[PDB]
Design a protein around this ligand. Structure first.
Ligand SMILES: Cc1cc2nc3c(=O)[nH]c(=O)nc-3n(C[C@H](O)[C@H](O)[C@H](O)COP(=O)(O)OP(=O)(O)OC[C@H]3O[C@@H](n4cnc5c(N)ncnc54)[C@H](O)[C@@H]3O)c2cc1C
Ligand SMILES: Cc1cc2nc3c(=O)[nH]c(=O)nc-3n(C[C@H](O)[C@H](O)[C@H](O)COP(=O)(O)OP(=O)(O)OC[C@H]3O[C@@H](n4cnc5c(N)ncnc54)[C@H](O)[C@@H]3O)c2cc1C
Ligand code: SF4
Ligand code: SF4
Ligand code: F3S
Ligand code: F3S
Ligand code: FES
Lengths: 257, 631, 127, 111, 131
């Protein structure tokens, strides 16, 4: 399996980058994409060039650090999987594969394929939580939560924060991430006391951070590794409309340190 | 001399009596103290959030992009608690007894009881934070048995309990960050520890994006950097997990407590070539059907399903027949490793054994097998590329967890005053074997309900401030770090970092791995310094210091691993008994279990860095058992 | 659907005296089956409505009421009972004076459940 | 001979100590046991429901038309508990003393 | 609900006419002896509720049999029955053993004898005489 790769190569944040081609002869069909990149990096180090840099921690599609735009589609051609879970059995002999990072104003590029995703952290910091201090919690079985509500909350709560929704969205919007967090916290009773403020704050933060708007295109849900449905965005819209009917004003934005 | 500082009296009131006896810091004065927290796992994030809620100035660190990337996120199993919600006979004392007996009587009783006593508060706090635990139809929490435990005491999300727990902790930490109490420094790794007048007073970090070397100073330092199971090249830990922080602290004066205590996992996806070092964890709920086998012929090109029943070497059945093929994971994995080492493997490189499910499919119904193993089968098909319903699975053991680490007393404080070690980086209370769904509980207990009190006591005993970042100790540590980095970059040999890491991991897995003997450990101790010298003489890490250089990080971690391997081999050679994960071939019962020696090795061994990597000093902390008796 | 040992403290959830009184009025059904024998259609609507009203007037019955009613109604259709024409003989025959407003409560619950897309489960086949 | 098998030590921890001392059946092994329960009163129905929730195979019996037609459906008085909600001096020890004195000292204290 | 109930049954209004009362046997504190594990003399036979002696002594306090039965069913019997079952091997006894056949034959003979007596006095006459 001979594979030709076109990898984006950028020295640093301010230095412009370009595509470079690397041809590799033997590629095991059952090894993952990241391991192929590792073999390429070892070959580059042996030859004497600068190795390709990319984010990877767990290699199980749970941590959410993998971030690659492969052949134009986020996380590789196969759906509902991350970049670390993509194997070369999904490609063809003699194929040409184009590798790029995410592209957004809120996700600055730091290296060849590494981006800065602290914008998601800042979105979380502006209300994406439940304000309960340690030691004050009541007993576990005090508040009943129906099985359906808990299941939907778990479906929305399994977001690995990869940022592929921003990369797939033509507008570069973080609506799926924000909607998933809002839906998770809004489907449990413990999230009731401050939900109508919460959503507003979170939405404002995204606008403050540099993300686009949502045209309901739906491209985000097609590449989401954990298959977050588009009904989270509808839930966020309902919450924001109800908050606007209550005269809820957004707080001050979270300025980065 | 190691003072455990354990309380006295009945074991039920020990934690409360200690809590009353310790000192306190007034809420007004808490803003005058600065605490450095290195690590943002379950333990690290929980500790940082709680100490920020208290009022202290917290400085949290992590080497990943975000605090929410950490192998606390990857945990699949549930989390234990003594709630007794299922009316099956669970209690705090039952959990304490289970944890102290599962550790093969190699841990302090007070710590285990404290953990079992605060587990209930852990679950209450996690529920109150919005963690989506599984619920029943009536709206109350659901419990499940951890595949062999005698009680159903486990709370779980569907398959990602660790992710939800870490997300709750990360949301609390984010709330504190928004309040201005906690300052988070992602993408920087602590490279050294600075001790001023015998107290850990700061750290020296390198920012991995720009290469900047920065000096931070604080009153107290907390280490939550996770386990060192990655010293073996092949392991189920994350690609970045390391032992740099704990090794630097140990070199500074901290005592390493039982470094040889390791835990492995029976069923993991085997490797697909000599380029992969990550083995994906499966579930222990497999092996219930058994049917572990290997072709009798050394080399067969026929399909696994084409092999007749009479031609299959169904080992683990003609050997150890009394157990019923449900042999303990230690014995099963030792047999599997021996079979693969004989040259009778089935994987790509010859590493792996067959786990067949065909007989289970025929005997049971495919509907129920799917309903209990669907996620596992889909994941295996996604990675391996073979359907378990038709072809047999392939599995191979790998190193999973490390019970060892820095020795700490009852106050979670190491030998160095002011240095607190929580999570997987301390020896703590798992003893010689970690029970299922206990590392998450231990980390959350240390972060939420234990560390605040002890750190407040220590801080109240001293006064704030007085140490800045211009002291000669900071300059010396920074100069040492700079010289080390420059030497690493200037070696420019031939072999890559991963080659040295792989060689070290294979040597450590063959000799100090699952089965250990005196001759093998002596040979490994002979071999380690040659590998270390070859690394320090013939390594090729390219790039520049002031960039995003990943090879430099890997080189530093590999150097620390090469130093730690010698100590753990020495510790394994020292302990002349079999207990828990640590197994010696000269001290086994004929069945194949671990034969202890309670009259000569009923202590915790702490190793002191004496400046020589071949002659570290041994200190014994005796263990006394009063409520649970060894048997 | 609450299991033994998992119950919280008794005074955790408050229940208004009026709601508890109406729940007790609906819950005092002795299961005699005279409502079926008096209804010209042979329908078990008063029995089902009484049980649904009992469980739907307390907070502990909230998490699964909209499914519950649907399931119960389907089971009656599966068992062979007729429909309800709002005639009212069952209320006049019922030994415990269960009012016809339990049927109105059941109708409200079923309408709301249909608005939410709740679908009945598999019927309970006799052994 | 009759062995009451009552625990030892202070009477407040007797039931907890016995609960810790007794054996257990793993939840996986519960489905291999069959238990016959004859009777569907308060005790019978409660026992059958709890043992079914545990996982055992339960075989419940009753001579009436339905399990609900059993006796104890006619009990008109209330049910006692040592919760002290009215704040008038009730407690577990007070209830134990009342029950053991109202029985004219003819019953075991541990029960 | 008591004057009305008395009027419904007796037919006389208590507000104008004196009530009539007569004592009757209500409860039995006695029964099969059980130990702390709610297990009778026969191993594996557990007696709960009103069928055992248990803890009412010589006199049952008001509102105590209800909580006694619920306690035995909910919070006591599971633990003790699990304790007994964990010490024995499941299964091994089928319904074809001679003990089952002998018990069934005894029951059949008893029923046949009862049906074939065909005397004069009815069952309730003997029950009334005994009572
Ligand atoms: C695959 C897997 C599955 C598991 N499943 C279970 C399970 O089902 N049940 C269970 O009880 N346990 C389980 N465990 C074990 C348990 O989850 C972990 O051992 C535990 O969470 C470790 O605690 P920790 O937070 O201290 O470690 P981590 O979460 O790994 O902490 C690492 C943190 O330290 C930081 N750090 C590390 N080194 C440095 C450095 N040099 N400089 C700066 N920062 C640094 C990292 O950035 C990160 O924030 C599992 C472990 C693994 C690997
Ligand atoms: C009118 C009345 C009022 C009472 N009021 C109170 C009160 O206020 N407070 C209080 O504490 N106690 C009260 N009691 C006592 C108590 O409620 C009951 O007497 C009894 O102890 C509790 O029910 P149980 O399940 O133990 O027995 P029961 O409910 O009587 O159990 C009978 C069950 O056993 C089954 N059964 C019996 N024999 C057979 C057989 N041969 N084969 C198969 N199945 C069989 C029946 O079908 C039925 O399911 C009252 C009793 C009566 C009669
Ligand atoms: S919503 Fe989906 S695509 Fe977006 S960050 Fe979360 S997991 Fe990734
Ligand atoms: S007639 Fe009344 S008491 Fe009898 S079954 Fe019908 S609703 Fe219940
Ligand atoms: S696809 Fe893009 S346009 Fe909006 S709805 Fe999703 S962010
Ligand atoms: S009388 Fe019969 S028809 Fe319906 S409303 Fe009552 S069950
Ligand atoms: S490395 Fe964790 S999602 Fe890819």
């Amino acid at each position: 399996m001979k594979i030709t790769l076109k990898i984006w190569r950028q020295k640093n944040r301010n230095t412009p980058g370009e595509f470079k081609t690397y041809v590799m002869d033997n590629v095991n069909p059952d090894m993952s994409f990241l391991e192929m990149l590792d073999v390429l990096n070892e070959d580059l180090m042996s030859r004497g060039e600068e190795p390709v840099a990319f984010d990877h921690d767990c290699r199980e599609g749970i941590c959410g650090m993998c971030s690659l735009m492969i052949n134009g589609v986020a996380h590789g051609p196969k759906n509902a999987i991350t970049t670390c879970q993509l194997h070369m059995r999904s490609f063809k002999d003699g194929d040409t594969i184009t590798v790029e990072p995410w592209r957004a104003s809120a996700f600055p590029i730091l290296k060849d394929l590494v981006v800065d995703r602290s914008a998601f952290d800042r979105i979380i910091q502006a209300g994406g939580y439940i304000s309960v201090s340690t030691g004050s919690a009541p007993d576990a079985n005090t508040i009943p939560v129906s099985k359906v509500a808990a299941d939907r909350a778990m479906d929305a709560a399994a977001c690995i924060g990869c940022g592929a929704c921003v990369a797939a969205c033509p507008n570069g919007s973080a609506m799926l991430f924000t909607a998933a967090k809002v839906t998770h916290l809004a489907l449990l009773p413990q999230g009731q006391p401050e939900r109508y403020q919460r959503v507003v704050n979170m939405v404002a933060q995204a606008d403050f951070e540099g993300f686009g708007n949502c045209t309901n295109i739906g491209e985000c849900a097609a590449v989401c590794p954990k298959e977050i449905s588009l009904e989270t965005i509808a839930q966020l819209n309902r919450d924001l409309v109800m908050a606007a009917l209550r005269g809820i004003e957004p707080n001050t934005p979270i300025v980065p340190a | 001399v190691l003072d455990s500082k354990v309380p006295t009296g009945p074991i039920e009131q020990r934690w409360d009596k200690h809590r009353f006896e310790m000192k306190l810091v007034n809420p007004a004065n808490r803003r005058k103290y600065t605490i450095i927290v290195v690590g943002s796992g379950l333990a690290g994030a929980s500790a940082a959030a709680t100490l920020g809620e208290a009022g202290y100035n917290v400085l949290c660190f992590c080497y990943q992009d975000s605090p929410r990337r950490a192998h606390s996120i990857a945990a699949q199993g549930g989390i234990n608690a003594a709630k007794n919600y299922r009316n099956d006979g669970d209690s705090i004392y039952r959990l304490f007894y289970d944890t102290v007996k599962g550790g093969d009587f190699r841990a302090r009783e007070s710590n285990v009881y404290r953990l079992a006593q605060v587990s209930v508060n852990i679950i209450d706090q996690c529920v109150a934070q919005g963690v989506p635990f599984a619920r029943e139809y009536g709206g109350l929490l659901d419990n499940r048995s951890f595949g062999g435990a005698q009680v159903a005491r486990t709370f779980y999300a569907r398959g990602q309990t660790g992710q939800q727990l870490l997300l709750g902790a990360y949301q609390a930490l984010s709330r504190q960050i928004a309040a201005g109490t906690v300052k988070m420094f992602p993408r920087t790794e602590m490279l050294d520890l600075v001790v001023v007048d015998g107290r850990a007073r700061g750290i020296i970090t390198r920012d991995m994006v720009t290469g900047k070397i920065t000096r931070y100073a604080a009153d107290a330092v907390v280490l939550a950097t996770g386990g060192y199971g990655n010293v073996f090249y092949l392991s189920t830990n994350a690609k970045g997990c390391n032992a740099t922080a704990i090794w630097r602290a140990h070199r500074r004066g901290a005592f390493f407590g039982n470094p040889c205590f390791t835990q492995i996992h029976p069923t993991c996806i085997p490797v697909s070539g000599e380029y992969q070092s990550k083995l994906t964890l499966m579930s222990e709920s497999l092996r219930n059907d058994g049917r572990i086998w290997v072709p009798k012929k050394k080399g067969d090109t026929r399909r696994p399903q084409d092999i007749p029943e009479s031609e299959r070497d169904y080992y683990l059945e003609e050997r150890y027949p009394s157990f019923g093929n449900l042999v303990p994971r230690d014995i099963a994995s030792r047999a599997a490793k021996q079979v693969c080492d004989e040259g009778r493997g089935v994987g790509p490189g010859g590493l792996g054994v067959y786990l067949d499910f065909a007989d289970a499919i025929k005997r049971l119904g495919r509907q129920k097998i799917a309903e209990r193993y669907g996620n596992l089968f889909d994941m295996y098909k996604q990675i391996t590329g073979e359907d378990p319903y038709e072809t047999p699975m392939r599995i191979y053991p790998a190193v999973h967890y490390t019970m060892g680490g820095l020795w700490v007393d009852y106050n979670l404080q190491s030998t160095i005053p002011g240095l607190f070690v929580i999570g997987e980086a301390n020896f703590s209370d798992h003893g010689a074997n970690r029970l299922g769904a206990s590392a998450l509980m231990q980390g959350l207990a240390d972060g939420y309900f234990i560390l605040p009190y002890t750190i407040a006591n220590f801080l109240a005993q001293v006064k704030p401030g007085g140490v800045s970042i211009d002291r000669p100790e900071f300059a010396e540590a920074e100069a040492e770090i700079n010289q080390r980095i420059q030497r690493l970059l200037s070696i420019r040999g031939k072999r890559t970092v991963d080659s040295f890491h792989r060689e070290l991991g294979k040597l450590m897995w063959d000799k100090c791995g699952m089965a250990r003997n005196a001759a093998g450990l002596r040979e490994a101790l002979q071999r380690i310094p040659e590998i270390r010298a070859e690394f320090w003489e013939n390594v090729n890490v390219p790039g520049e210091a002031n960039d995003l250089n990943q090879a430099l990080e890997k080189a530093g971690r590999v150097a620390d691993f090469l130093e730690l391997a010698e100590l753990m081999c020495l510790d394994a050679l020292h302990r002349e008994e079999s207990c828990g994960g640590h197994f010696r071939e000269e001290y086994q019962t004929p069945d194949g279990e671990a034969l202890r020696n309670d009259e000569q090795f009923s202590y915790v061994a702490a190793w002191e860095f004496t400046g020589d990597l071949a002659k570290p000093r041994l200190h014994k902390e005796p263990l006394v058992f009063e409520y649970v008796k060894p048997t």
